[PDB]
Amino acid sequence: GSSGSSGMWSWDVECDTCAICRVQVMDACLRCQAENKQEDCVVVWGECNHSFHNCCMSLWVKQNNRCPLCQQDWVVQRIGK
Numbered sequence: 001g002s003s004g005s006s007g008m009w010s011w012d013v014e015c016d017t018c019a020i021c022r023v024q025v026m027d028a029c030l031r032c033q034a035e036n037k038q039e040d041c042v043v044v045w046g047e048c049n050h051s052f053h054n055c056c057m058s059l060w061v062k063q064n065n066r067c068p069l070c071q072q073d074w075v076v077q078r079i080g081k
């Protein structure tokens with residue numbers, strides 16, 4: 001007897017993700033998850049209503065001081081989990 005059928009499609013329910021590293025802004029980035037610095041990898045919200053990785057952003061502004069989502073004047077609104 002042959003085998004059944006498999007293959008589960010995916011959706012785009014995952015949004016508002018740190019484009020800098022392309023990692024769940026809620027969780028630690030690939031740079032913090034490997035170094036185990038999650039506790040430090042916090043979420044930084046901007047005036048443009050865009051959450052990012054306090055660690056990434058800091059490194060992003062080094063090259064582009066503009067939100068990689070709306071390329072708008074990045075303004076650290078609030079920081080925290």
Ligand SMILES: [Zn+2]
Binds near residue numbers: 018021022
């Ligand atoms: Zn990131």
Ligand SMILES: [Zn+2]
Binds near residue numbers: 030031032
């Ligand atoms: Zn990080």
Ligand SMILES: [Zn+2]
Binds near residue numbers: 046049
């Ligand atoms: Zn933005």
